[PDB]
Design a protein around this ligand. Structure first.
Ligand SMILES: CCCCCCCCCCCCCCCCCC(=O)OC[C@H](COP(=O)([O-])OC[C@H](O)COP(=O)([O-])OC[C@H](COC(=O)CCCCCCCCCCCCCCCCC)OC(=O)CCCCCCCCCCCCCCCCC)OC(=O)CCCCCCCCCCCCCCCCC
Ligand SMILES: CCCCCCCCCCCCCCCCCC(=O)OC[C@H](COP(=O)([O-])OCC[N+](C)(C)C)OC(=O)CCCCCCCCCCCCCCCCC
Ligand SMILES: CCCCCCCCCCCCCCCCCC(=O)OC[C@H](COP(=O)([O-])OCC[N+](C)(C)C)OC(=O)CCCCCCCCCCCCCCCCC
Ligand SMILES: CCCCCCCCCCCCCCCCCC(=O)OC[C@H](COP(=O)(O)OCCN)OC(=O)CCCCCCCCCCCCCCCCC
Ligand SMILES: CCCCCCCCCCCCCCCCCC(=O)OC[C@H](COP(=O)(O)OCCN)OC(=O)CCCCCCCCCCCCCCCCC
Ligand SMILES: CCCCCCCCCCCCCCCCCC(=O)OC[C@H](COP(=O)(O)OCCN)OC(=O)CCCCCCCCCCCCCCCCC
Lengths: 155, 87, 99, 13, 558, 128, 177, 459
């Protein structure tokens, strides 16, 4: 590799834009850079942020797992839009509709568990009754002190 | 498991499917009968035949190849390509 | 429309070459040319010798050290006879029967 | 019959 | 005494011996899968003797046999806890694994890496019996991370496939999010109790134990696929069928449930931990059973089945009934491993077909597979006096008759109905009706490996609940007095689920085409939860991992 | 009539529901033909090196080399400190550091005040 | 849209692909075979109602709201074939698909284990290397100025020659190694 | 310590008087004999350090770093001998001489009884490393790193020099043994604040610190394999060793001067680990992993509990072995595909199964799989920082998710998936390369059996 195929600074003149689009091996009309706010992207082409999962799978690819060709200017986040990672593919249900259904479902189930914790169900019984002063020596009571009498009666 | 496919087997199964099709007569059907020009079928009928091949052999033919398979011999040759027959 | 005559010719030529390659991936009756190289021994090698090793280990190295193998003491019921002492545990109180 | 050759890398090294 | 501890260690050393065999190899093997299956059969036979002499007296012990480290007040020793939980889990795990490997000698016969597969499956078994026998938190963390890594290696078995690697990394991600809470629990016990040993944790018996139990609940969420950290267990069906059968149905995925059953003296004195376990388990057993109603891959449906059963296990821990939960683990292993084995027998017979919409007509084509699939489904739903009756129904017989979150009970009953719904859905689309698979029938099951491997778990799925529940001692008091509408709850709800799903299945023969409802789109796209968070949380990471982390700060400003 | 599909950042619009896919104009023919021409030329330039027997090595891809040089080298020499770069390097640069600083300082002052007042249960805490 | 030979989709191809995807998603909706076959002839009638539409702008609009119909009525998890992309067995054996040149890196003690195979592989490689320069000088005189327009390659024209760019298509790994 | 310095110096007449085909074999043999000799330093005591002379001593902190240093030289001679095959013989002997001189500087850097001899040897280790990186680095593009080395000299080693001369005038000595018993508390003052920064910032850049790690994914990339091995394995750990010596004098002001830098590490390991998820360069990914692991050692030294020092020195030894093996795996692919791009050569388990086994083992040690000493160090640091503050477990555990995430991603990208078609020079694994991976991994696995020799002076 040599210098005139390497990235450079932001294209200002249209002939530098044409030289870059010839360098990045794409049409000049499709070639748009990242906007020169000073974030250091340089003259790299702003690809339209499509995940590689979205591509044609039956197409004869150079890189079949990446769904990518030789000499094609890759996406800037190509390490991010691999099929092991972030996807942007279309879904059968809308994005905001998914977020609304998920948030309503999760928050409503949380609220219903809070309602059921507010109002607990039980059995029509008294408490469970244990002998020997509510099992005082079994539950770790000291042998020198003597507790109050816990006496249960027949019924 | 996984029985080997042969061109006799692929040929006989593709013709066995096309002989169970009510727009193709079983007496004019040959191994080189063109769907549009010789058997007189529609492109809709051709898509139904390639989908019947997909139903028959248990895999998918993509559309860039499904738009060009225009005889049973092309079907047998394409399944021979995608299944590596006569090793 | 289907293929062109150029595409049908190319697919036929490639198909002939592909079938020749796949047929020539076959094997010879000599191939692979290899270079020139007790009924219950499983229970002896895999069980009995490890039971010997682990019994020697636990008997003379682990239990000879304090608190390494600590065991829950066995469950004593009314009516039992103690082997270390010879003492018979008395039974429970007579039952205020319910049935 | 019809034994097929399995292409694999060199397991010798 | 000298028999118990000796055969206890002989079981684990015997499981490790084929790992030394496969690592010290020069020849090509005289059927190394048969060698590992023979070894695990004999390890089962070996572990049967300590279990029988535990059922005789109740004999528990600890083998703290090898001193490993002493960090100034923390003596980390190699310590094996042989209690009721190990004595009931080790023979069940070895029996299930022995059936899975006799299954795998048929199913995985075309794989040229079969010795690596049996090696990895034995490594999983070794790490799992390290997990369930560990006496301190460190050896349990060894087994914990071991079953996580062998889960990675057995999901990504076909490592060329992108989806298998994706699902394996997904499972590692959710398990390490659970490991955050496990390390939180280890940190709390080391700082406040000066121990990782279970005995000093139980003897000190802390009262402000909300934070370590929240850590353990997050660990069981990461491990047993509870809600929030669940979708890796349906994603993990991309691995082979005996992987999903052994690991991700019956053996690995119960380890978060086993972690919470293991710490029962802390949960029985913390009502807040019981309430959080009850709410999370009811949420998971609702959600995964609801997602199972509208799926078409049979491995996905049985994975949602096992995750709903794990949610029910979390429920019955959350009502302070841990021994019923562990009886449900030992019960659930048999029929759920058998259901995955029969589903994979259908898959391998129908030439790698897993979608239930291209099955059917297999009542008379695969008769033994149909018999065992019906027996596994009926044990799952709670047919009377199969194995799944002897725990799950009792769970309902303690979920009704206790001081319980009422909505958790109602969602538990809705889950109990949904189990019957997806079970008869599997029997409808896969066994009943007319065929839908392609035309070249290669349907066959007449291998003694497959038939005997399903047969021994069939004997388990018929008799094992009766045998175990009549061989285990009481550790709680079984609540046996309740009104007749409350005793007949689980059976009636299960039969109502069968009736509702039979009406649903007989609405499919009608010649009508309805537009999809919002409930169908919700349950079919998995509550929209793997669709959003698997896109959003990586995105908000990785752009933040590139724009501000790499480019802005650590290449320009700093 | 029908619910229109809403595109998103992580849910792109399909190829079928986009209107500009159904352009029939000759300038779209020219653009599509030039894209097919560049793609075919790059495909040919690749697989003449790929199918060459005399080459045994790596067909070097200057788009990949250009991508890595953009992701590593071109970050500093095309930086310009302005309002946007300084404010975004002050938000995610010294923001969460200050956040976790005050959180951990608050919790440690609370714990120290509870320890020197005899409040914190430091009973069995002898490993540290 | 994105194709190797054509730069676009013709309207006829768009109609056939939408018909095929509609039938596949319908079969996903309509599991049973007689029921799907009934609705399949109904949908074939719906597609053949406007088969004879001459106006390509009106057919464009009808195809567009047909895509809206198909998107409104699609199944969320349609039946994907197992070895089709998105299937459960898709690209499963790609970890077993070793490229052929790795046979060149074998040791001679295991090359001698299969003598006939490598003795034939030598003349396979011989065939490739005496075909290469002829097919390069074939491609350099047929390709137009500016490079080739479409990705399709010409066949072998002379007798005795081989088609250009053929070695990786012929010697590709089997789909079940 | 003079039974180790003199054989290391006798490796110079051994490497210059050796026959031209024998200079790798002889230096590898005698450096392996020195590494076998290096186990005599395990004569440690529970109360006293092993004090040889007025000039050299060894407690249980310096001893494992010495054993790792004397073990690292044969591995560097194995790793760097392939890509120096077409080199001149005299230049090859110059390379081996700079490696031997770096070991010579290090093994009396770790044993330095007095702190200004530690400073001289500490800043002496930079020169052979500099010459190795810039004469055998295969490309040199250091337009931004010159200004950063100027920043290292300004903010780092020179205030350390002035501070150590000040302690020499105040205390009367810089013997660490004397400073154990003559240490005065360093109270709150501005003089003592600049004193703390002078004593700490050199070692902060040497670890490296987050925000100060700008040199490390450059100097690791532009280096040969032996340079990257000694940077990852030893030369970062000089900062941690120097912090554990110099924080004796910095009490109790450390108890409120640690709070900024702890934040810089606790958030910093969240960032750099995340940075490893977006690395195109594999060697840069291993560099940012080294930053993400040395952040925990910075926190564990600054919180100065016993469990934190035990975990920090165990993490230093374990990460030295692990990251050195990771750079050697990265080179074992770079010597074939001739590019460091991690997405270039994929699916390598189809081609190299044993090397993919080594990738799997180095990844599992990288993500701290128990009972490996990576996990023991990681875990003890996490316990001690929980004792520091109970919220930090979140910033620990989240790191322990992302540390897993890039560890397997590096495994999944390079070894799994579909192999790259147009790369056909992927040779089978040379026995040298597999021997290098095993001499990394098998000591790292054997140290799980007996970790007490790598847990420092207060085990
Ligand atoms: C002091 C004396 C001590 C004696 C005892 C030994 C102590 C440990 C020593 C080192 C152990 C590992 C050795 C093998 C691994 C490295 C080489 C390798 O990959 O070989 C593959 C090869 C077998 O594969 P292959 O099919 O032939 O070819 C490779 C394949 O192509 C492709 O490969 P593959 O993918 O098919 O298979 C790779 C597979 C992949 O499997 C995995 O990745 C799974 C591993 C993780 C999950 C399971 C383990 C989880 C942790 C629980 C177990 C540990 C604690 C147990 C204790 C009780 C519970 C607390 O790895 C294995 O099977 C390795 C088994 C051992 C793994 C140990 C853990 C590694 C994980 C990372 C660290 C974890 C924490 C530290 C553990 C420390 C243990 C002491 O093995 C050999 O040929 C063996 C070579 C000779 C080995 C000698 C070992 C001793 C060396 C030390 C010498 C000095 C002391 C003298 C003792 C001599 C004894 C003979
Ligand atoms: C086929 C193989 C078997 C060998 C066949 C040939 C020999 C025949 C059998 C007899 C063997 C010899 C007699 C018995 C052995 C010696 C007994 C003895 O006292 O040995 C001294 C000691 C016993 O310990 P100790 O308590 O005496 O001393 C510990 C040392 N200090 C005090 C300094 C800390 O060592 C052993 O027994 C070593 C064997 C241990 C077995 C388990 C090893 C597991 C390794 C895992 C690594 C990671 C651990 C992580 C987990 C830690 C816990 C959470
Ligand atoms: C790293 C960033 C800070 C480096 C500061 C320069 C090295 C200082 C080394 C320690 C010197 C010392 O003893 O300081 C206390 C001495 C105190 O003076 P003294 O010790 O002579 O005073 C007698 C003692 N008391 C304080 C009780 C009266 O500090 C100084 O004299 C000045 C210290 C700051 C140096 C300013 C110039 C450099 C600025 C930063 C450049 C980078
Ligand atoms: C009992 C208490 C319960 C508490 C519940 C609330 C707390 C937990 C909240 C949920 C956290 C987990 C969910 C969010 C992250 C999930 C990431 C994941 O799993 O990604 C999977 C994704 C592939 O998924 P999928 O789309 O199914 O792929 C198949 C077809 N493409 O794979 C990819 O896209 C690859 C991405 C690789 C890089 C991942 C970057 C994100 C890392 C996330 C770390 C989260 C750490 C959380 C720490 C919490 C600390 C308290
Ligand atoms: C366990 C006891 C099972 C038998 C008692 C319950 C009987 C019952 O109510 O069955 C309901 C139903 C049969 O009724 P239905 O399907 O509506 O009418 C056609 C009849 N072949 O459906 C069935 O009988 C099928 C479901 C039976 C569930 C058995 C497992 C519980
Ligand atoms: C940039 C590269 C990447 C990052 C690497 C690290 C670079 C920076 C290194 C230093 C970090 C910040 C300084 C250390 C903070 C320690 C606490 C402190 O000084 O608090 C601020 C101080 C509060 O007052 P106080 O501490 O009571 O002062 C009396 C002391 N006897 O407040 C004040 O006194 C007011 C401010 C006075 C000016 C202080 C200047 C000296 C410190 C910076 C050098």
């Amino acid at each position: 590799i040599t210098k005139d195929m390497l990235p450079g600074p932001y294209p200002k003149t249209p002939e530098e834009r044409a030289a870059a689009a010839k360098k990045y091996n794409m049409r000049v009309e499709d070639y748009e850079p990242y906007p020169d706010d000073g974030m250091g992207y340089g003259d790299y082409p702003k690809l339209p942020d499509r995940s590689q999962q979205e591509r044609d799978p039956w197409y004869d690819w150079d890189h079949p797992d990446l769904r990518l060709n030789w000499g094609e200017p890759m996406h800037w986040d190509l390490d991010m839009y691999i099929r092991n990672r972030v996807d942007t593919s279309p879904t059968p249900v809308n994005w905001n509709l998914m977020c609304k259904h998920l948030f309503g479902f999760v928050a409503f189930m949380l609220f219903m568990f809070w309602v059921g914790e507010t109002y607990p169900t039980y059995q029509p019984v008294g408490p469970k009754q244990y002998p020997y002063n509510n099992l005082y020596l079994e539950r770790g009571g000291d042998p020198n002190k003597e507790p109050e009498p816990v006496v249960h009666y027949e019924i | 498991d996984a029985p080997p496919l042969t061109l006799e087997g692929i040929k006989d199964r593709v013709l066995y499917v096309l002989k169970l099709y009510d727009k193709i007569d079983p007496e004019k059907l040959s191994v080189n009968s063109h769907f549009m020009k010789d058997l007189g079928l529609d492109s809709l009928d051709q898509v139904e035949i390639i989908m019947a091949m997909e139903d028959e052999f248990g895999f998918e033919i993509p559309d860039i190849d499904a738009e060009k398979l225009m005889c049973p011999q092309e079907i047998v040759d394409y399944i021979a390509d995608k299944k590596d027959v006569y090793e | 429309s289907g293929y062109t005559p150029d595409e049908k010719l190319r697919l036929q030529q490639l198909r002939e070459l592909r079938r020749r390659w796949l047929k020539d991936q076959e094997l010879s009756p000599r191939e692979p040319v290899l270079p020139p190289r007790r009924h219950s021994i499983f229970a002896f090698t895999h069980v009995l010798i490890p039971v010997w090793i682990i019994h020697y280990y636990l008997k003379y190295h682990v239990t000879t050290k304090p608190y390494t193998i600590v065991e829950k003491k066995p469950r004593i019921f009314p009516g039992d006879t103690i082997l270390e002492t010879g003492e018979v545990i008395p039974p429970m109180k007579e039952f205020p029967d319910q049935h | 019959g019809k034994r097929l050759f399995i292409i694999k890398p060199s397991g010798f090294y | 005494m000298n028999l118990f501890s000796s055969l206890t260690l002989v079981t684990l050393i015997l499981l490790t011996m084929p790992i030394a065999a496969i690592n010290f190899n020069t020849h090509k093997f005289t059927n190394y899968p048969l060698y590992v299956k023979t070894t695990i059969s004999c390890a089962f036979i070996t572990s049967m003797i300590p279990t029988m002499m535990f059922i005789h007296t109740g004999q528990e012990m600890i083998i703290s046999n090898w001193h490993w480290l002493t960090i100034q007040t923390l003596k980390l020793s190699l310590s094996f806890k042989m209690d009721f939980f190990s004595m009931m889990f080790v023979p069940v795990a070895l029996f299930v694994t022995w059936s899975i490997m006799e299954f795998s000698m048929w199913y995985m016969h075309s794989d040229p890496n079969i010795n690596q597969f049996f090696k990895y499956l034995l490594l999983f078994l070794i790490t799992m019996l390290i997990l369930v026998t560990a006496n301190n938190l460190f050896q349990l963390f060894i087994g914990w991370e071991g079953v996580g890594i062998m889960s990675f290696l057995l999901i990504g078995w076909w490592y060329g496939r992108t989806d298998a690697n994706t699902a394996a990394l997904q499972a590692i991600l959710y398990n390490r999010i659970g490991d955050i809470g496990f390390i939180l629990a280890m940190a709390w016990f080391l700082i406040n109790l000066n121990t990782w040993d279970l005995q000093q944790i139980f003897m000190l018996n802390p009262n402000d134990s909300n934070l370590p139990l929240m850590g353990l609940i997050l660990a069981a969420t990461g491990k047993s696929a509870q809600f929030g950290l669940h979708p890796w267990l349906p994603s993990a069906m991309e691995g082979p069928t005996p992987v999903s059968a052994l690991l991700h149905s019956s053996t690995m995925v119960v380890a978060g449930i086993f972690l919470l059953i293991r710490f029962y003296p802390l949960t029985e004195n913390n009502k807040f931990g019981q309430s959080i376990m009850l709410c999370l388990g009811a949420m998971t057993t609702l959600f995964t059973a609801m997602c199972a109603l509208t799926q078409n891959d049979i491995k996905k449906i049985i994975a949602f089945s096992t995750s709903s059963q794990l949610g029910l296990m979390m429920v019955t821990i959350g009502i302070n009934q841990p021994h019923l939960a562990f009886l449900h683990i030992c019960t659930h292993a048999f029929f759920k491993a058998m259901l995955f084995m029969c589903s994979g027998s259908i898959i391998h017979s129908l030439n790698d077909e897993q979608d239930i919409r291209k099955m059917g007509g297999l009542f008379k084509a695969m008769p033994f597979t149909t018999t065992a699939l019906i027996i596994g489904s009926l044990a799952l739903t709670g047919m009377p006096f199969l194995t799944g009756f002897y725990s799950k129904d009792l769970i309902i017989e303690s979920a009704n008759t206790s001081y319980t979150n009422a909505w958790a009970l109602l969602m538990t009953l809705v889950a109990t109905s949904f189990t019957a719904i997806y079970s008869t859905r599997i029997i409808f689309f896969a066994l009943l009706g007319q065929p839908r698979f392609p035309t070249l029938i290669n349907i066959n099951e007449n291998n003694p490996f497959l038939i005997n491997s399903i047969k021994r778990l069939l004997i388990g799925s018929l008799f094992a609940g009766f045998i175990i529940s009549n061989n285990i001692p009481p550790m709680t008091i079984p609540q046996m007095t309740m009104p007749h509408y409350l005793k007949m709850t689980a059976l009636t709800v299960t039969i109502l689920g069968f009736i509702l799903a039979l009406e649903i299945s007989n609405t499919t023969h009608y010649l009508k085409f309805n537009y999809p409802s919002n409930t169908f789109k919700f349950s079919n796209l998995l509550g929209y939860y793997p669709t959003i968070m698997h896109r959003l949380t990586p995105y908000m990471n990785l752009t933040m991992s590139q724009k501000s982390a790499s480019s802005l700060l650590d290449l320009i400003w700093l | 009539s029908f619910p229109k599909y809403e595109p998103s950042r992580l849910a792109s619009l399909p190829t079928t529901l986009d209107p500009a896919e159904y352009d029939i104009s000759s300038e779209t023919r020219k653009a599509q033909a030039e894209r097919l021409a560049i793609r075919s030329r790059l495909k040919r330039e690749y697989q003449l090196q790929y199918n060459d027997p005399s080459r045994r090595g790596v067909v070097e891809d200057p788009a990949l080399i250009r991508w890595t040089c953009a992701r590593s080298a071109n970050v500093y020499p095309n930086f310009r400190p302005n309002t946007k770069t300084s404010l975004l390097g002050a938000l995610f640069g010294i923001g969460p550091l200050i956040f976790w600083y005050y959180v951990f300082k608050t919790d440690r002052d609370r714990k120290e005040k509870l320890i020197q007042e005899g409040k914190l249960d430091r009973t069995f805490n002898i490993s540290y | 849209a994105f194709l190797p030979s054509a730069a676009y989709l013709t309207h006829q191809q768009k109609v056939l692909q939408l018909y095929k995807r509609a039938l596949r998603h319908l079969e996903s909706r309509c599991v049973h075979r007689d029921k799907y076959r009934y609705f399949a002839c109904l949908l074939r009638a719906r597609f053949d109602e406007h088969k004879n539409e001459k106006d390509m702008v009106k057919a464009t609009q009808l195809l567009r709201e047909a895509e809206k119909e198909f998107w409104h009525g699609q199944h969320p998890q349609p039946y994907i074939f197992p070895e089709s992309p998105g299937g459960t067995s898709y690209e499963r054996y790609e970890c077993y698909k070793v490229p052929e040149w790795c046979l060149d890196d074998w040791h001679p003690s295991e090359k001698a284990m299969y003598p006939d195979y490598f003795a034939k592989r030598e003349q396979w490689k011989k065939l490739r290397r005496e075909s290469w320069e002829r097919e390069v000088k074939q491609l350099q005189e047929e390709t137009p100025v500016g490079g080739p327009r479409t990705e399709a390659l010409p066949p072998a024209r002379k007798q005795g020659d081989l088609p250009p760019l053929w070695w990786h298509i012929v010697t590709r790994p089997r789909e079940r190694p | 310590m003079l039974k180790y310095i003199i054989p290391t110096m006798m490796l110079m007449p051994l490497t210059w008087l050796s026959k031209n085909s024998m200079i790798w074999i002889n230096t590898t043999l005698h450096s392996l004999l020195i590494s076998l000799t290096s186990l005599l330093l395990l004569n440690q005591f529970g109360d006293n350090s092993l004090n040889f002379s007025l000039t050299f001593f060894s407690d249980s902190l310096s001893t494992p770093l010495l054993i790792l240093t004397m073990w690292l030289l044969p591995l560097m001679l194995m790793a760097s001998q392939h890509h120096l095959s077409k080199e001149n013989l005299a230049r090859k002997k110059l390379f081996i001489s700079m490696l031997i001189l770096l070991q010579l500087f290090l093994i009396m850097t770790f044993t330095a009884t007095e702190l200004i001899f530690f400073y001289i040897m500490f800043e002496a280790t930079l020169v052979p490393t500099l010459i190795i990186i810039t004469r055998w680095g295969n490309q040199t593009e250091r337009l931004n790193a010159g200004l950063y080395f100027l920043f290292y000299t300004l903010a780092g080693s020179l205030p350390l020099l002035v501070a150590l001369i000040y302690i020499q005038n105040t205390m009367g000595s810089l013997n660490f043994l004397i400073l154990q018993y003559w240490v005065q508390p360093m109270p709150n003052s501005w003089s003592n604040t600049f004193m703390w920064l002078a004593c700490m910032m050199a070692f902060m850049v040497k670890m490296p610190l987050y925000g100060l790690h700008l040199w490390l994914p450059k100097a690791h990339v532009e280096a040969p394999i032996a340079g990257s091995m000694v940077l990852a394995a030893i030369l970062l750990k000089l900062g941690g060793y120097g912090m554990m010596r110099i924080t004796l004098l910095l009490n109790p002001i450390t108890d409120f001067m640690a709070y900024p830098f702890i934040m810089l590490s606790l958030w910093g390991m969240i960032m750099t680990s995340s940075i490893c998820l977006r690395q195109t360069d594999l060697k840069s990914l291993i560099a940012y992993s080294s930053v993400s692991h040395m952040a925990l050692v910075i926190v564990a030294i600054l919180i100065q509990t016993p469990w934190s020092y035990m975990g920090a020195t165990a993490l230093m030894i374990a990460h030295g072995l692990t990251s050195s093996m990771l750079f050697c795996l990265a080179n074992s692919n770079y010597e074939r595909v001739h590019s460091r791009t991690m997405i270039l050569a994929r699916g390598l388990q189809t081609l190299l199964p044993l090397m993919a086994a080594w990738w799997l083992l180095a990844s599992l040690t990288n993500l701290a799989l128990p009972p490996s000493i990576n996990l023991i160090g990681e875990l003890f640091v996490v316990m001690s920082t929980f004792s520091w503050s109970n919220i930090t477990i979140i910033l620990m555990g989240l790191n322990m998710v992302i540390t897993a995430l890039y560890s397997l991603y590096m495994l999944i990208t390079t070894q799994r998936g579909k192999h790259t078609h147009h790369i056909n020079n992927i040779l089978p694994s040379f026995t040298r390369e597999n021997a290098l991976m095993s001499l990394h991994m098998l000591p790292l696995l054997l140290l799980s059996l007996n970790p007490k020799i790598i847990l420092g002076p207060l085990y």
